[PDB]
């Protein structure tokens, strides 16, 4: 994983978006293309929309979802059985 010494991968674009949102102290739906960003608990009230190769999916953040990458919560593959 992203080892300790390096520090996490919290990409600058949505870092800047959330800096905007928490400097305004209001929280809105957000659209982003970055599965690869790991999570800080700063996002718990924030709301993100994330891409599935096809569309977006707005999703709300929570305490225990930290330490994860958002794509864990964006379903990539549909499978329905046979």
């Amino acid at each position: 994983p992203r080892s300790l010494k390096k520090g996490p991968f919290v990409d600058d674009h949505l870092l800047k978006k959330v800096d905007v949102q928490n400097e305004k102290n209001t929280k809105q739906v957000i659209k982003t293309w970055s599965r690869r960003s790991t999570i800080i608990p700063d996002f718990i009230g924030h709301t993100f929309a994330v891409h599935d190769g096809r569309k977006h999916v707005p999703v709300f953040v929570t305490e225990a979802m930290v330490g994860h990458k958002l794509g864990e919560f964006a379903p990539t593959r549909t499978f329905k059985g046979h």
Partner: peptide, 20 residues
């Protein structure tokens, strides 16, 4: 910058400039 233990990684954002 990012190899030693004496780095500004505490507050670098050299990671971020690399993303830039």
């Amino acid at each position: 910058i990012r190899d030693p233990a004496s780095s500004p990684e505490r507050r670098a954002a050299a990671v971020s400039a690399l993303q830039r």
